[PDB]
Amino acid sequence: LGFLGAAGSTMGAASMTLTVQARNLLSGDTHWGIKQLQARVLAVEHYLRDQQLLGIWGCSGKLICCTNVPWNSSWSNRNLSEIWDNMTWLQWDKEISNYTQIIYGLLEESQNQQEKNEQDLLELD
Amino acid sequence: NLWVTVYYGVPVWKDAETTLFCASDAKHNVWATHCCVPTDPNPQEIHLENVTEEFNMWKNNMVEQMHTDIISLWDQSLKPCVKLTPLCVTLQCTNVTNNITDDMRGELKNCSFNMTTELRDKKQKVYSLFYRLDVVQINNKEYRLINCNTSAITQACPKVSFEPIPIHYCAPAGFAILKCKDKKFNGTGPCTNVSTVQCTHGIKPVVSTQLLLNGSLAEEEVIIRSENITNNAKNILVQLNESVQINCTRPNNNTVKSIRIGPGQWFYYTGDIIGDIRQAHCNVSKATWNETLGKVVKQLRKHFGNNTIIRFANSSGGDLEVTTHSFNCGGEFFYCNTSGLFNSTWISNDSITLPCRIKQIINMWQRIGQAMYAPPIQGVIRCVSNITGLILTRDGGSTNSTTETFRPGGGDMRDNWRSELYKYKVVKIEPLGVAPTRCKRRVV
Amino acid sequence: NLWVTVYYGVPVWKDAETTLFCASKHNVWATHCCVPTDPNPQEIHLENVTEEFNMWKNNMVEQMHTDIISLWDQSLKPCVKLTPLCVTLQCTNVTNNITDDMRGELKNCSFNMTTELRDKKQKVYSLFYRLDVVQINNKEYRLINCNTSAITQACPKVSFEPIPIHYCAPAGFAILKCKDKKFNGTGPCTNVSTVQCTHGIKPVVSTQLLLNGSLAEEEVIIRSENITNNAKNILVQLNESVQINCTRPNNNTVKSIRIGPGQWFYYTGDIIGDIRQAHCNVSKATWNETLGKVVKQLRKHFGNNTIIRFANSSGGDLEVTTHSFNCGGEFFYCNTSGLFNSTWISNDSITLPCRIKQIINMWQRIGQAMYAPPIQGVIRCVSNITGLILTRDGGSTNSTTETFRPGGGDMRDNWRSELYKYKVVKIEPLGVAPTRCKRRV
Amino acid sequence: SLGFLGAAGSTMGAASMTLTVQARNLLSGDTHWGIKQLQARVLAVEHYLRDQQLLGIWGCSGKLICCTNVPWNSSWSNRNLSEIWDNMTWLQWDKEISNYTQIIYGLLEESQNQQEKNEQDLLELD
Amino acid sequence: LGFLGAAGSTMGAASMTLTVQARNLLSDTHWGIKQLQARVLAVEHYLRDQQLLGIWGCSGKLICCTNVPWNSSWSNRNLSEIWDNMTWLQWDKEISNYTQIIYGLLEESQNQQEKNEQDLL
Amino acid sequence: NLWVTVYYGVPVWKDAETTLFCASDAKKHNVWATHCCVPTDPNPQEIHLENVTEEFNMWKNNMVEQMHTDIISLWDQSLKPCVKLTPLCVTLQCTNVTNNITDDMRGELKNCSFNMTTELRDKKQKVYSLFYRLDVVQINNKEYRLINCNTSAITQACPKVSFEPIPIHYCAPAGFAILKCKDKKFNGTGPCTNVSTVQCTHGIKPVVSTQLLLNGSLAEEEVIIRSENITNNAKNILVQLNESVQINCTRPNNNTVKSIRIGPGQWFYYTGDIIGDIRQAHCNVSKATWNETLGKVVKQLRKHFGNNTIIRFANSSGGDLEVTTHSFNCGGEFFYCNTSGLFNSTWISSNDSITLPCRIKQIINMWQRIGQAMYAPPIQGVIRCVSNITGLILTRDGGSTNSTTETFRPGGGDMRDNWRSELYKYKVVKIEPLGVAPTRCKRRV
């Protein structure tokens, strides 16, 4: 399908559309010219912020990444079978509201530790 | 077995506000000049399977942008044009008396004044006819133009066409336009048939005050949409599922003359008139009108009770711009009397002829401080247009008589675009998210 | 033995220039600085950091100058022009209810102005101050700027009252603060911290003496780019404020006319009651103690065996020789010679007369004249002196007696006071260092 | 954690654990005024991208800390390693050298070129 | 040697300058806008190239080997001609507008590889 | 047994339009320099490309189009803050200047008077001045108005602003490169084998003139004649000379310039009087040089027309002064010089400098646009300028009956042609870093 045809997709099914969603993110009177110029700049800023975060978390090389952060019961209490193919991703997303900063902080810290540990030992005399 | 996985490129979005740009493709038309992007929307439609969305037309920021953008284009288009400041002089006038019917007695005045010309040193005496609506007595009598005590007036440039053409609004990267596909949607429902486009439908900016012209029709039934049905002080936007054809003319054959005032600045004169003097008129089929209103009433009573009697009275007192049906017909500005359309009470072929007046000074968008002068148009004017909807208000002040009254409404023009784009929403794309996987990062 | 290793995100910076944005109802400042500031200062004190500051080279001063000029020019852009009024005036003196501290100061003028219709003229009467009117030669007069510049009426609905202004760094930049007690404006500073934005600095415009600014804290602090060089101004920051109560005592009437379609002109009309000169009241006791404190601090720069005298101002135009400020929206010019008479050898207030002027050539710029519409009623304000601009009279022959004269200068020096503590730097995330490891291959 | 540049007083070694905060604060989050603001945003982006491009070129993309295959030259600096990492901050370090920037970058560019061409030959062989 | 210097060199030889080119791709209201528009476009083109290398799994390498088989239909020219005699300009003329075909194929190979790894982890 | 190999930083490009930025050197109030505040590099680069071929087409070149667009804009922006002369167009009363003038230049000037508004709105002042007849049109007793009064507002150019052309370098934005053809003898309408890449163009002065190309690039080997279509007689022929010819032009009379205030800081300048001799403006070009130069051009034309042809020169078609004469700016004044003295002879199968008269006018419809006008303040003192002719613009009459005799005449057209000549050797391309090729490697899985 095309962009967003995955809207009704389950979390499992949705994994096969990560490339259509990703490829469509980039690009397609004084006051008019400025407004459109501003819009283009903002699109770039949003793009870069997302890339920076994936970089920081160590998942910049993939559309799908396993992290070194455990899942918390304070975030959700559902089964793997409940979530995959028995859940539509759009709803899964509303269900994780307010957990964004918690999760990001954890991703940053676990990545900080992994890089540090590798520097101390794999690079060791 | 409890871990975190992260994804990029997930099909997720949030309600969002961004700036849209226009595009249109089909001479010196302002809309055509401005909306320079080619469109050609061949791949636009993507259906979203298993999607329900919340829409709310009354909070549509796109309406606000159209209002803003339309005014901006209008003003910009009039900047490189002739200023008529030099015409704020004492004007001497007498009555036009020749070949005038009763309906037009005193309507036109024969005026003259001392105008400047190319050299500062030279003056010229000129003559013109005016509609009484544009001229005020000073107090053989002396007059001034109505705008001179408030602001300078600018003459619109004759080559420039403001004729509305379909305009498509296109999203910037990172955004999408989401559309409701529900024939019974009243503007705020949780639509269960949703699709998206990158650029929307070509909707033309037709501007009017009592009834709505050249819009879309409802697919199956008349739909009555209001932000608060209960609130009497709201415009009710009624969309018809059938159009009503209306024919409207300006029967007098106008001679247009022009005089140079400045180095390249020219002013257009009304000249004189060929043919007996008559007022302007619009014609609506009586039977069609009666069927149309009855259809509205049935739906209206579904909201207000099917044992209710509904009176459709004419407009309330107020300024011409408020009480009449105002529209642009062939470049001319008409102010028509709609009382002839609202004289029935609903309980359990000839046309309707509506007299109309013409005014050349327009305080468009009700923004006081500026005025535009509409040059006279050579010959006669005829246009045909479709009534695709209307605006009503409740009169209120009920006595629990179960007899509601709905006079015609009015207001700014935001409601006009809200009606046409009631089905569209804008969202932002959000590519990142996580899930409760059982996979841990595999590390040394 | 050692290898090159590189890092990203290294906490270092370089001196740099950039554009700071402004952040905080018909007030020009409020309108422009529509962006709110965060409620949280977010200041990080740095440990083990010394930084070098130089207030005389702080480019933030230049930015503020540019920004203020822009706002004034923008603000007057949509206002009615008064060029239709550059006509010959017929004037006589106002002689009734005169105390003679203003004899001939105000004149009664009349003129034929254009009304909204071009073919109708009207006789109008008004009262003008001598400062705005010159003789052409019941004599023929003209406004002072009708031979040099266009005159624009400031819009009656727009306030220019200064509000605190905060400047904020763009991403990639940071602002460092000095905050070193008794710092003289230059060199290494050890009380350094990092901030996102400056505090709110109110852009009060004045000459000779600075009003409603920051204090010197514990001691009076005197700063100059060069102590010896008499070409430099001396910025004296007081450690306590001095209040001054200033008024325009006459009860005025405001009248207006249409000079065009939607074009209204405002004028002084009539005066209710009798005539009194504008004036400012300064406590002498406070003032005399204040000056002594200033001298005690000046002594560390010139020697404690030197005798000091304070002189009145030098010659120049009104904007140069008198103290100037905006009070109630009116423009006051005050004679401060009475404040600088004494010598220091090793309620009892003073009243300073003031003058009122309506046509203002702002910022020492010529070609853009602003007309100040009249204010009805009586004007009163109380302002705080927080510092002075002084110069050393110069001409010294090493006589051991020195004289300091009130100075003044470009508005940049006033902003230089509150911008004293701030510096902006660019962040440089990359760096290289030696280590033990070689890249794994 | 002190936050952005709170590491200014930290030793070079200690400061390595704050590289992430410094990275986070590099991205953001009247006709003339509008232009000035656009210029500011564009330049910030250009600087960000230039640093990322170079990390790519030098083969350290995705890392905050990267070992290279370029040996250290004592002509740039000849100091005790323990003094560098434990008794100096990064700001002091930068000031200590404030040189040889182009030399180092040239060495990094080439050592990456050597590594990628060697990988290409080996992979075509197997 | 220099920016786009060895333009006439063969495709194989040309590998020696690919880095110089990469390093040189990054840096009155009407005038100011023209310049901003130019800067923005340069950024957009740059990011699109990076995005493509990302989606194909080549973002970490200047020179990338992929698993997409070569189609003799696109070109039946020999490696002995392509790397040793032809230049990149000539080659591009002979790519005969099949670039987008290859892009679609590269994208599919990458999708398969990322999914397979995730199932294996 | 092949797969796809992906490369980044690939040395390929495409023809592409983009704008260039303007740069200038370190050498006031010069309009060009004021706009082009970006300095050029002290050390320019050029890389010759070995085993390179390219194609140039000067007739389809957006570099020229940009230069035109920007030069117009700059001109107009420069006049934005200058005093408008709107109040100046009042009934003008004139008599002819005949008492001090020789029969030559007699009748060129009129002595006119008018009542103009001064600093105060209540007053007018009586002003009289000298005018060229070309700026004044009769109304009908003697009664005149300014010639462009009934077309547009006239703005006085600001007297401090210099328009003297300075070399301008156009520089590529990142992602783009400028290619140039170094072939010693080519017409730039096709393939080139000596090609190099540069960051910026050679500086080109923004000289404005018609039917004659002044202070440009000189050909090095021979006269080179180029056109878009040789057989199309409706097109201009650009002739690039390989030897320059010096032309000495003057405005010989010593005037007096006066000025008045017409408003609050508004100054108007006009010619007050003339002291001494009154003579027509003129230009002097060596005859011998001209005949040899023209002969070289003819030899070059013969290469395209035949061994037995007859090459006739004649003057241009009649029409507006602006298209008919060799217009140019000399010392800041606008000259409209005769052409016929140089185009009379037919070529068959001290130095007697030719003197041509020049007209001068102060109201100019700049850039051949209608609806705008500028007034040239009078310039105080005697004016002399000496310049180099580096090229010519001619048309062929066509309508051939194969008589073998053909006529060439001076002619003009859009001023872009002047810049096409200077830019005939440059092209702009977009750099395209990605590409693919077949390989013997596959990824490890």
Ligand SMILES: *[C@@H]1O[C@H](CO)[C@@H](O[C@@H]2O[C@H](CO)[C@@H](O[C@@H]3O[C@H](CO[C@H]4O[C@H](CO)[C@@H](O)[C@H](O)[C@@H]4O)[C@@H](O)[C@H](O[C@H]4O[C@H](CO)[C@@H](O)[C@H](O)[C@@H]4O)[C@@H]3O)[C@H](O)[C@H]2NC(C)=O)[C@H](O)[C@H]1NC(C)=O
């Ligand atoms: C609802 O929708 C309808 C249908 O589109 C609109 O009706 C149209 O209104 C426009 C504007 O008045 C009409 O266009 C004008 O037609 C004039 C007459 O043209 C005749 O001859 C041509 C052939 O040459 C026929 O195609 C045409 O049907 C007529 O028989 C022209 O003279 C007008 O020209 C104007 O502009 C030119 C420059 O472009 C000037 O030189 C002219 O002097 C003049 O100013 C113009 O083209 C159009 O014909 C109507 N369509 C139909 C089917 O009748 C309604 O107006 C719209 N309602 C609302 C409220 O918007």
Ligand SMILES: *[C@@H]1O[C@H](CO)[C@@H](O[C@@H]2O[C@H](CO)[C@@H](O[C@@H]3O[C@H](CO[C@H]4O[C@H](CO)[C@@H](O)[C@H](O)[C@@H]4O)[C@@H](O)[C@H](O[C@H]4O[C@H](CO)[C@@H](O)[C@H](O)[C@@H]4O)[C@@H]3O)[C@H](O)[C@H]2NC(C)=O)[C@H](O)[C@H]1NC(C)=O
């Ligand atoms: C092709 O190229 C030639 C270059 O030689 C051009 O001819 C030159 O034109 C310029 C512009 O008018 C001349 O420069 C002017 O010269 C005037 C004469 O003064 C002479 O003596 C002084 C003594 O120091 C010299 O510096 C000066 O160069 C002259 O030799 C000056 O009075 C002018 O200054 C005034 O005008 C300028 C305008 O920019 C102002 O900036 C100044 O403040 C001042 O008001 C000016 O310097 C130059 O002299 C000419 N060269 C020759 C032959 O002498 C041709 O014009 C050009 N072709 C075309 C198409 O024009």
Ligand SMILES: *[C@@H]1O[C@H](CO)[C@@H](O[C@@H]2O[C@H](CO)[C@@H](O)[C@H](O)[C@H]2NC(C)=O)[C@H](O)[C@H]1NC(C)=O
């Ligand atoms: C342009 O073509 C010439 C050949 O005409 C190239 O010369 C080669 O030089 C290398 C050494 O650097 C030799 O090993 C080759 O054998 C030469 N080629 C031939 C056919 O003899 C020259 O390198 C080419 N220039 C560029 C930039 O590629």
Ligand SMILES: *[C@@H]1O[C@H](CO)[C@@H](O)[C@H](O)[C@H]1NC(C)=O
């Ligand atoms: C919507 O639901 C149907 C089952 O009724 C399913 O086959 C289809 O794939 C779903 N749509 C999407 C985008 O997954």
Ligand SMILES: *[C@@H]1O[C@H](CO)[C@@H](O)[C@H](O)[C@H]1NC(C)=O
């Ligand atoms: C989950 O979050 C709570 C806070 O609500 C915290 O106390 C707990 O330690 C967290 N557990 C894990 C496994 O992260």
Ligand SMILES: *[C@@H]1O[C@H](CO)[C@@H](O)[C@H](O)[C@H]1NC(C)=O
């Ligand atoms: C986030 O917190 C709010 C608090 O009111 C809650 O309503 C909402 O459901 C939460 N979102 C989640 C847990 O997805």
Ligand SMILES: *[C@@H]1O[C@H](CO)[C@@H](O)[C@H](O)[C@H]1NC(C)=O
């Ligand atoms: C608006 O809607 C509410 C709920 O239906 C109703 O109570 C209210 O009366 C409405 N507005 C007014 C002013 O009637």
Ligand SMILES: *[C@@H]1O[C@H](CO)[C@@H](O)[C@H](O)[C@H]1NC(C)=O
């Ligand atoms: C409605 O009709 C009445 C009947 O005379 C009239 O007075 C009134 O003005 C009409 N509408 C308006 C504008 O009030």
Ligand SMILES: *[C@@H]1O[C@H](CO)[C@@H](O)[C@H](O)[C@H]1NC(C)=O
């Ligand atoms: C008016 O006032 C001036 C003060 O400048 C004085 O010189 C003059 O004599 C006065 N004239 C009259 C009428 O007394």
Ligand SMILES: *[C@@H]1O[C@H](CO)[C@@H](O)[C@H](O)[C@H]1NC(C)=O
């Ligand atoms: C107004 O104009 C008349 C013209 O007769 C003149 O006498 C009178 O003095 C003028 N009045 C003023 C105040 O200038």
Ligand SMILES: *[C@@H]1O[C@H](CO)[C@@H](O)[C@H](O)[C@H]1NC(C)=O
């Ligand atoms: C200030 O400048 C003068 C010269 O103008 C010099 O003699 C003196 O030493 C300078 N003093 C300082 C504080 O640098």
Ligand SMILES: *[C@@H]1O[C@H](CO)[C@@H](O)[C@H](O)[C@H]1NC(C)=O
């Ligand atoms: C002078 O002052 C008295 C007292 O307020 C007042 O009654 C009188 O009218 C004033 N005279 C004039 C000319 O204003």
Ligand SMILES: *[C@@H]1O[C@H](CO)[C@@H](O)[C@H](O)[C@H]1NC(C)=O
């Ligand atoms: C960098 O090298 C230059 C070469 O002379 C030197 O002047 C400069 O001081 C060096 N940088 C520092 C500050 O160490």
Ligand SMILES: *[C@@H]1O[C@H](CO)[C@@H](O)[C@H](O)[C@H]1NC(C)=O
């Ligand atoms: C491919 O063609 C070239 C040139 O004709 C030839 O040298 C080569 O042997 C052919 N096949 C291969 C790859 O050997």
Ligand SMILES: *[C@@H]1O[C@H](CO)[C@@H](O)[C@H](O)[C@H]1NC(C)=O
């Ligand atoms: C010019 O004007 C004078 C008036 O003195 C007249 O004698 C002469 O003939 C006129 N010349 C022409 C050709 O207009």
Ligand SMILES: *[C@@H]1O[C@H](CO)[C@@H](O)[C@H](O)[C@H]1NC(C)=O
């Ligand atoms: C233009 O060139 C073509 C050859 O490409 C030629 O056939 C044609 O006749 C030329 N046009 C004219 C008017 O000679």
